[PDB]
Amino acid sequence: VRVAINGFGRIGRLVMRIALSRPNVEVVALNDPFITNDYAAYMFKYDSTHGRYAGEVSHDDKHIIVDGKKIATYQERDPANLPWGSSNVDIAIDSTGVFKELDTAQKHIDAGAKKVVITAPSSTAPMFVMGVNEEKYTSDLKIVSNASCTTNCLAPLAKVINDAFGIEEGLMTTVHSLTATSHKDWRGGRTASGNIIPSSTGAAKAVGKVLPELQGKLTGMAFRVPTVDVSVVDLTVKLNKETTYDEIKKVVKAAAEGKLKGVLGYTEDAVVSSDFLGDSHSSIFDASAGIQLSPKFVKLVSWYDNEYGYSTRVVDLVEHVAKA
Numbered sequence: 001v002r003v004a005i006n007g008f009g010r011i012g013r014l015v016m017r018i019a020l021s022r023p024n025v026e027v028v029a030l031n032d033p034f035i036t037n038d039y040a041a042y043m044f045k046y047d048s049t050h051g052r053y054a055g056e057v058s059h060d061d062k063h064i065i066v067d068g069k070k071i072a073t074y075q076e077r078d079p080a081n082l083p084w085g086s087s088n089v090d091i092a093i094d095s096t097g098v099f100k101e102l103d104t105a106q107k108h109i110d111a112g113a114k115k116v117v118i119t120a121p122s123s124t125a126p127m128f129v130m131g132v133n134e135e136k137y138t139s140d141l142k143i144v145s146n147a148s149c150t151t152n153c154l155a156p157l158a159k160v161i162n163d164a165f166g167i168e169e170g171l172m173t174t175v176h177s178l179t180a181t182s183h184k185d186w187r188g189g190r191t192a193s194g195n196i197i198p199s200s201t202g203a204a205k206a207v208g209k210v211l212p213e214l215q216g217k218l219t220g221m222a223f224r225v226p227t228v229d230v231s232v233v234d235l236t237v238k239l240n241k242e243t244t245y246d247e248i249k250k251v252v253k254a255a256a257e258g259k260l261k262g263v264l265g266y267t268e269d270a271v272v273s274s275d276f277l278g279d280s281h282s283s284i285f286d287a288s289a290g291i292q293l294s295p296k297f298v299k300l301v302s303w304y305d306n307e308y309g310y311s312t313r314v315v316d317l318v319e320h321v322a323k324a
């Protein structure tokens with residue numbers, strides 16, 4: 001599966017790191033009009049949180065070079081201008097956040113790619129979350145979205161809980177770090193470094209798009225904090241069926257070891273956020289942190305590396321869309 005990456009922000013770069021090590025994915029090309037190849041190599045090699053790339057990174061006038069692999073680089077502001085047809089590109093991965101709708105991501109198909117995966121929520125492209133609704137993908141869909149990192153954390157857990165106990169209603173808080181991506185959000189323009197900063201989040205509503213049965217049943221908000229790029233979801237749900245916390249743990253652990261293996265993780269250890277840097281799960285259930293007040297009222301806690309697990313999911317979706 002031959003892929004090209006549009007945009008070399010943090011997501012674009014971690015997607016590259018993961019796709020390079022994927023045996024059946026070949027990174028063919030990178031486009032980003034705002035950087036030179038020397039800067040691209042620098043940004044790819046070094047990462048404050050996920051370590052130096054464990055391999056040799058260099059560049060020449062036309063490539064980024066990684067452990068012998070030449071990745072052709074381009075600087076096109078209009079993705080339609082890109083030689084995806086000539087380069088035999090199967091899937092274009094758009095990590096810019098600006099070509100995220102059906103009519104704008106179309107530019108990659110227009111350029112010769114067979115399909116597009118958008119690493120951002122879309123209003124028009126169908127959204128898929130691995131372990132949640134990837135079975136609903138059909139090969140005629142040429143442009144898809146991987147939703148958001150927070151939705152990828154919430155949705156697998158909400159599905160497991162809803163399938164086993166039924167979610168009547170849930171309110172969510174995310175304690176959210178300074179991750180990838182101020183006159184529309186006044187709080188967000190204040191200094192990060194010493195502040196807890198409340199914020200809106202559409203993750204709890206966007207779960208309704210990938211789990212229609214939870215449409216309108218979840219909402220929430222975020223407190224943003226100046227920590228490493230691992231965040232945590234705090235989901236307070238009202239359940240339809242009575243249960244015990246022990247039963248919740250067994251169901252989550254069972255899903256984590258079985259059908260959601262690799263997507264939903266499970267720990268009982270005394271973890272803190274930095275313990276999940278570089279974790280490739282979308283959602284790691286913190287069994288010891290949750291708390292049950294009564295048989296149908298529980299608080300569930302789940303961690304996610306807001307760059308790395310999501311980027312692993314992007315590559316997962318690329319392979320799933322290509323296998324179909």
Ligand SMILES: *[C@H](CC(=O)Nc1ccc(C#C)cc1)C(=O)OC
Binds near residue numbers: 307
């Ligand atoms: C996951 C990374 C992420 O959480 N970005 C993010 C989300 C909300 C806010 C605010 C306010 C800032 C940054 C991701 O990018 O999903 C694709």
